[PDB]
Amino acid sequence: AESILEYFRPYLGRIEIMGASRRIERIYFEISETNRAQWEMPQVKESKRQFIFDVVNEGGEAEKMELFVSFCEDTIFEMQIAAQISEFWGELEVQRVKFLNYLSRNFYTLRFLALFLAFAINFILLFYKVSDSPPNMVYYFLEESTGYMEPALWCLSLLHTLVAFLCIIGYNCLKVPLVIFKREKELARKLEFDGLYITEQPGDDDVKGQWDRLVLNTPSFPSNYWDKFVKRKVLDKHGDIFGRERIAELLGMDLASLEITAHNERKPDPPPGLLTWLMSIDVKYQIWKFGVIFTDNSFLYLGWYMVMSLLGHYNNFFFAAHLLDIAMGVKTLRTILSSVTHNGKQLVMTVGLLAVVVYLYTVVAFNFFRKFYNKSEDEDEPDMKCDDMMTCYLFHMYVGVRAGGGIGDEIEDPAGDEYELYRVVFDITFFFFVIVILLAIIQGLIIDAFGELRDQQEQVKEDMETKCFICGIGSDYFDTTPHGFETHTLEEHNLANYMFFLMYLINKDETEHTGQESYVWKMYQERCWDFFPAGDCFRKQYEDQLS
């Protein structure tokens, strides 16, 4: 039967679990070709790199399984969205569905096209010129030899604005549902397992905690999330202790209504008119969704991009502000800017501390030494800079710091004066403190940011090349047999296999669950995360009889 095994090899998945008994057990299941292809999709496989990075660096080990399960949930939701978007009234609805699907599929190409249009529209502006006469006081106009440049500028500006609008629409169509799903999933988790609203209330520092109270009474709370009985479970858990009717009012549900609907309920005909649709819209839920979507970092950046695109029609040079997109338009540019943003608070406080020592030098140079700060070569009038404390402080900061030699090369030399030694000490201390000492800090901070980033990358690589992710057993034990660690990492315990098993359990019906699948499902509903093999494997369980 070799041929059948070769045919069904990609579709057969195996998983090791702790099991009901004290022995590690192995489960075989089916993997769909569509799911396998979506997993082999480059971005889905790219998300694993980031998940691994955030669990290895700045990540615990006791909560590692919970984080892995949350990552699996997010990946399943993204796969569902990708499957959804793959490939009079009814006519307009169908056309708009195709339009939204097209935007969702081609979201990134719109971003790249916007970058290209910004570069072209900024190249065109390099030919601009100021004149006194018309082509009143100033007559800024584009001077060029080859014609068809102003019409090109106008058309490119219009096209850039249109592409920016399409980018906003595509982002709102494709990326927002994941954010909403995560927010609602977390809210349901802490509502049913911690009772943050039943027991006590969210703290005043939790602005999102206060904002989450809006969807408690809405009839669309479990939307954009797998579970729709979270309110029922919360009621059944907290009613006996905090008052069943109180919890029902808090969650906006009617126990009598649900009971009578369970007994027998009449189904009214759905009216499709806009008049009834208006109140079919859940205003409070939409308000909460808008509140949680307007705080997104990416959405605010896209809104700023759109605002700048609109302002570009008022004045063309505003389009130059779009060049900054290359900071987040190139993968490696953001990596080299991470060495500046990371460890940047220290940079801010160092540049703030630089403003204090200059103040001390200003006070010293204001009580005395202020006859040297004259800057007028003619005797007609003086141009003293240290007569006031504000002017002297401005002079030292603006001119003294930027000077290569320090403060000594700007003011009158102290030769042949009573305060020659004091001025020499003053200048030398200034040069050795605010030039060679307070800039080495700035350089060292960023150099060490680079070094620490490299150390983090190599640490992640070593950790993943050293020991197993699930069991935690080192590779030395598995390396007794040839290619033991690789065989273990690709066949025995595989993250893709665990994700596929979770998706299979979610998809398949409850009545079709076998004993082991039922056990895993009922343990999964309670966030136990105990069925995962921790510190044990099938080979270790059956070292004798050679497994």
Is residue 469 a known part of a binding site? Answer: yes
Which residue, 179 or 534, is less far from a copy of itself as judged by CB? 534
468 binds, among a copy of itself, Zn ion, none (CB under 5 to 8 A by kind): Zn ion
- Tell me the C-alpha distance between 448 and 434, whole Å: 21
Candidates 38, 16, 11; CA nearest to 470 is 16
* Contacts to Zn ion by CB under 5 A: 468, 470-471, 493
Is residue 233 a known part of a binding site? Answer: no
Which residue, 271 or 474, is less far from a copy of itself as judged by CB? 474
CA dihedral over 334, 335, 338, 340, signed as positive or negative: negative
Phi and psi torsions of 142, nearest 5°: -85, 115
The nearest distance, CB 344 to a copy of itself, in angstroms, is 11
The nearest distance, CB 159 to a copy of itself, in angstroms, is 21
Which residue, 271 or 535, is less far from a copy of itself as judged by CB? 535
Candidates 227, 201, 103, 312; CA nearest to 506 is 227
Is residue 466 a known part of a binding site? Answer: yes
441 binds, among a copy of itself, Zn ion, none (CB under 5 to 8 A by kind): a copy of itself
Which residue, 332 or 511, is less far from a copy of itself as judged by CB? 332
54 binds, among Zn ion, a copy of itself, none (CB under 5 to 8 A by kind): none
Candidates 432, 441, 440; CA nearest to 407 is 432
The nearest distance, CB 320 to a copy of itself, in angstroms, is 5
Is residue 208 a known part of a binding site? Answer: no
417 binds, among Zn ion, a copy of itself, none (CB under 5 to 8 A by kind): none
Matching residue, tokens 């669309």? 220
The nearest distance, CB 134 to a copy of itself, in angstroms, is 16
Is residue 304 a known part of a binding site? Answer: no
Is residue 490 a known part of a binding site? Answer: yes
Which residue, 185 or 493, is less far from Zn ion as judged by CB? 493
Which residue, 76 or 386, is less far from a copy of itself as judged by CB? 386
Is residue 45 a known part of a binding site? Answer: yes
Residue 35 neighbours by CB distance under 10 Å: 19
390 binds, among Zn ion, a copy of itself, none (CB under 5 to 8 A by kind): a copy of itself
- List the alpha helices (DSSP H) in 86-197: 89-105, 107-124, 150-174, 176-193
Is residue 190 a known part of a binding site? Answer: no
Sequence-separated contacts (24+) of 125-128 with Cβ below 8 Å = 125/153, 125/316, 125/317, 125/319, 125/320
403 binds, among Zn ion, a copy of itself, none (CB under 5 to 8 A by kind): a copy of itself
Is residue 467 a known part of a binding site? Answer: yes
- Give how far Cα 60 sits from Cα of 190, 473, 475, 536, Å: 20, 17, 21, 20
Is residue 465 a known part of a binding site? Answer: yes
326 binds, among a copy of itself, Zn ion, none (CB under 5 to 8 A by kind): a copy of itself
The nearest distance, CB 261 to Zn ion, in angstroms, is 48
**Is residue 47 a contact partner of residue 67, using CB atoms and an 8 Å limit?**
no
Query: Using the 8-state DSSP alphabet, how is residue 397 labeled?
Result: I
The nearest distance, CB 470 to a copy of itself, in angstroms, is 12
The nearest distance, CB 458 to Zn ion, in angstroms, is 23
- Tell me the C-alpha distance between 249 and 198, whole Å: 11
| DSSP annotation string for 498-547 | HHHHHHHHHHS-GGG--HHHHHHHHHHTTT---SS-SS--HHHHTTGGG-
Q: Please give the annotated binding residues for caffeine, written as ranges.
A: 226
Binding residues for ATP, as ranges, are 45-49, 464-469, 489-495
Q: Binding site, residues?
A: 45-49, 226, 464-469, 489-495, 511
Which residues are documented as binding site for Ca(2+)? 511
